[PDB]
Design a protein around this ligand. Structure first.
Ligand code: KLR
Ligand code: KLR
Lengths: 304, 304
């Protein structure tokens, strides 16, 4: 028992982290097979970031201008190309530590682990969720760009995020591994405000199920609700609408606990309307939304 | 910017995890050089756990009864010994992935990462603190025993915890890597109640400094206090007494923010007396105490 914000073991991803330097800019790269992926803004100076023309800036760069270092050994760059907002640097050596991997583009509400890196070196690992406004609330300093987000299915690493930017509000934006930003964000130092950071309702419900499995049951009430009634309350509280797809996804947790999904919705509705009254659920004084139903099942069953 | 509950990158520890089976009991072992460390209760049946005589139970076990498997390959056991509550199984092969390491016994209030494992396989990594009552609030299921807690200083892994038990209250107990339990706990299925789980005051103050560094400043007030006055309030709220040693440890954060330690104590005193009033600090609705002053400095400076 016990329920923690758990990240995936990061070893398979640590084996892929490299340092990429272009001119005076140093950030992280991801080395998979003979390709190093990194944010294209490695080619920018701080001044270029205000209004960069990436195609134009890239013309002035050759293979030898991209310095790639894996540990304390230099990799030879034999090709470079821009794909959306990432650069792909072809190196002459396949990464011997390349795990089985996929590039996936996640949906808002999905969680993943981030291996925060500086100078190609891992500093820490933490669990994130793609917010409904397509930002992530990470822990990234200058030099962390190119750090990646991922999930692991047994031996397969699915890379879903590469860190590119910090918005003026301190929230983070980045791309999938095809270089496409999540949401409307662009790799330019300009006014980019994030939309409403709504709460991921299906994740809160999953976490309430994790709470019941682990003994925290005080919030269970005598009520039920309907999807439409619950959604009127969800809208009032800036929660994402709950769909029948979310109810179906919560099916296994409902079966394991014997608590019907709509009954858990009624418990969540009362928590929204009444607050916690100074009580906690799984050591939290707020409703946690960065555990998906799959995360709760995985953690509660001991999947390796 | 941004502040997350971050664990150390787990790769160096993943390379040490093995599965240990003795009879019908399977748990995890830590393979460092030619020794595999694991909880001595691997020799017990579920019935033995009610009242085990470990020296007596161990007489019936030979080297060939300890089955050690690293990945899908069997290790040869050439010796075994009991040191306090751990067994040390000498194997004929040094772990080729042994990192630079130390065995450290931590103090209450210190934090560490746990690599939760099942069947010698890593399932996830999370950040813990040794509670003042010598329990940890982990996420461990049956089969997780032998999972370890650790800190990393550049390339040196300091192992501080090995998981042994879940108390009837769902909190966790274990040993250092010399097999000595933290606190008064014993490896027996008996009545073991934990003492008061007080709040680690110096960690809360460190986290309030992390909050100020990252822009959450609403809780800063116009007051100051003294150590004695603050400690009268700390006692009332089941917070650990703050000592001059803790003030000295918070010195660097005080210098960086320009907020004197006793002024931050006065802010904490008002938060204790008035509550959060529905507001949050670093996305939390409670005062977080599982970040040490060193963790805040490390995370806020990007140490790899
Ligand atoms: C655009 C600003 C806000 C300045 N930085 C970032 O948005 C990110 N850092 C960054 C570093 C260098 C370059 C190239 C320009 C040069 N040299 C581009 C970006 C960042 C910072 C903090 C946390 N996360 C991400
Ligand atoms: C003593 C009890 C409460 C039953 N288990 C534990 O305290 C721990 N499991 C455990 C497994 C096997 C053995 C040997 C007996 C056999 N076979 C000893 C201990 C545990 C469980 C859940 C989470 N953390 C740790």
């Amino acid at each position: 028992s016990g329920f923690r914000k758990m990240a995936f073991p990061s070893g398979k991803v640590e084996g892929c982290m490299v340092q990429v330097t272009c001119g005076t800019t140093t950030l992280n790269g991801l080395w998979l097979d003979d390709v190093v992926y990194c944010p294209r803004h490695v080619i920018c100076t701080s001044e270029d970031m205000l209004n960069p023309n990436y195609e134009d800036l890239l013309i002035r760069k050759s293979n030898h201008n991209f310095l790639v270092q894996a540990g304390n050994v230099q990799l030879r760059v034999i090709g470079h190309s821009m794909q959306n907002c990432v650069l792909k640097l072809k190196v002459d050596t396949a990464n011997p530590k390349t795990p089985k991997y996929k590039f996936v583009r996640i949906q808002p509400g999905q969680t993943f682990s981030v291996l925060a890196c500086y100078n190609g070196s891992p500093s820490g690992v933490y669990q994130c969720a793609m917010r409904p406004n397509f930002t992530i609330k990470g822990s990234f300093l200058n030099g962390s760009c190119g750090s990646v987000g991922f999930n692991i299915d047994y031996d397969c690493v699915s890379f879903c995020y590469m860190h590119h930017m910090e918005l003026p509000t301190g929230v983070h934006a980045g791309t999938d591994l095809e270089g496409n930003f999540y949401g409307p964000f662009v790799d330019r130092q300009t006014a980019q405000a994030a939309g409403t950071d709504t709460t991921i309702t299906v994740n809160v419900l999953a976490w309430l199920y994790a709470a019941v499995i682990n003994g925290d049951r005080w919030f269970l009430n005598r009520f039920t609700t309907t999807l439409n009634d619950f959604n009127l309350v969800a809208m009032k509280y800036n929660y994402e609408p709950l769909t029948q797809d979310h109810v179906d996804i919560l099916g296994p947790l409902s079966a394991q606990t014997g608590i019907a999904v709509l009954d858990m919705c009624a418990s969540l509705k009362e928590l929204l309307q009444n607050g916690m009254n100074g009580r906690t659920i799984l050591g939290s004084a707020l409703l946690e939304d960065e555990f998906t139903p799959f995360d709760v099942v995985r953690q509660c069953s001991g999947v390796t």
